[PDB]
Amino acid sequence: SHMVDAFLGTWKLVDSKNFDDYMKSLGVGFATRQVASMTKPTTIIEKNGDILTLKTHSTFKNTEISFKLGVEFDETTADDRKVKSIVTLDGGKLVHLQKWDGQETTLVRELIDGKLILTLTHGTAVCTRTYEKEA
Ligand SMILES: Cc1nc2ccc(Cl)cc2c(-c2ccccc2)c1C(=O)O
Numbered sequence: 576s577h578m579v580d581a582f583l584g585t586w587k588l589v590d591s592k593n594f595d596d597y598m599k600s601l602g603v604g605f606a607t608r609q610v611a612s613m614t615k616p617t618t619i620i621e622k623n624g625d626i627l628t629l630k631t632h633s634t635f636k637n638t639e640i641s642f643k644l645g646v647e648f649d650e651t652t653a654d655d656r657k658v659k660s661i662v663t664l665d666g667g668k669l670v671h672l673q674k675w676d677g678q679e680t681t682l683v684r685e686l687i688d689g690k691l692i693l694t695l696t697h698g699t700a701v702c703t704r705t706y707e708k709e710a
């Protein structure tokens with residue numbers, strides 16, 4: 576859509592809250608958390624007609640997903656969960672839902688003041704990750 580166009584580009588992490596707690600909630604062990612916490616990853620968001628691609632680049636792990644809005648797709652996460660995923664658009668918010676093993680976690684991205692804010696939720700664990708556009 577025209578709402579999606581605003582997310583397009585290269586984004587760099589400049590701040591983080593509760594990410595270690597989030598990973599813990601998912602079951603990521605201390606050793607891996609220490610490593611993933613330390614990194615300051617870059618996320619590339621691109622569009623190719625109907626297909627959105629989302630790339631994360633970092634020393635900890637590189638991941639890439641492509642998908643169409645509203646169409647369920649399989650995903651292997653950075654922490655190696657095999658999940659059923661679906662990305663929707665609620666107004667300004669790009670809402671990513673992952674299901675697996677009777678569990679659910681949401682990854683919401685919205686634009687606020689030219690910054691991309693990613694909110695990762697799993698149960699009581701709520702993580703806020705702030706990105707600045709590189710352009
Ligand atoms: C994050 C953490 N770190 C710990 C380190 C050491 C020990 Cl012994 C326990 C914990 C626990 C914990 C888990 C179940 C019952 C009670 C505590 C937790 C927790 O996630 O709740």
Ligand SMILES: Cc1nc2ccc(Cl)cc2c(-c2ccccc2)c1C(=O)O
Nearest residue numbers: 598599600601602603604605606607608
């Ligand atoms: C190092 C350690 N020691 C523990 C001792 C006891 C219990 Cl119950 C839990 C832990 C945990 C833990 C593992 C996953 C999620 C949450 C906590 C850890 C940790 O890997 O971070």
Ligand SMILES: Cc1nc2ccc(Cl)cc2c(-c2ccccc2)c1C(=O)O
Nearest residue numbers: 598603611614616631633635636653654
């Ligand atoms: C969205 C997401 N979900 C995750 C869930 C669990 C773990 Cl362990 C890592 C991630 C990561 C990630 C964080 C740092 C470097 C690389 C990837 C990301 C990501 O920002 O791309």
